[PDB]
Amino acid sequence: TDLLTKIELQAYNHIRTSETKELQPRIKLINTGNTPITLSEVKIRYYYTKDQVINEIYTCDWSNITSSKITGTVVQMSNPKPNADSYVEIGFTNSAGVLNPGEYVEIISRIGNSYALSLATPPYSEWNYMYDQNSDYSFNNSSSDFVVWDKITVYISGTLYWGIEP
């Protein structure tokens, strides 16, 4: 048909140190087509290797649509690839609404051991909260602000609409 569904995904890592106690992917999903997209149908995946980190949780610190409309889950991959044995899957609630052409959602996230994300000393050996980021498929070690980024994937109703799987 003659109304195109199209998106662009921009992202960067807000912490780019080789080791981190929190993954900080920041993502901007933009509707660049001319069809509205129902947000609850959209899933975004940030792929990484969990290394020896435990108690992994997701939190959304902020979104331009507010964090209560955002969902995030940490998923272990049944079929791991090099640099990808886990992904953070970010989604939207049933009542998140519609992303019209020209609109965007921005999502600021933190992922890590629940005890590290509280900014208190985790009661663990370092390896149980410190990630290695260069072993993470979706990690961008350089950009200090949003860039178009092909290594985070986006699905609408289960179909891949953006990005390259690991």
Ligand SMILES: [Ca+2]
């Ligand atoms: Ca890793």
Ligand SMILES: [Zn+2]
């Ligand atoms: Zn900053």
Ligand SMILES: [Zn+2]
């Ligand atoms: Zn260290």
Ligand SMILES: [Zn+2]
């Ligand atoms: Zn592959």
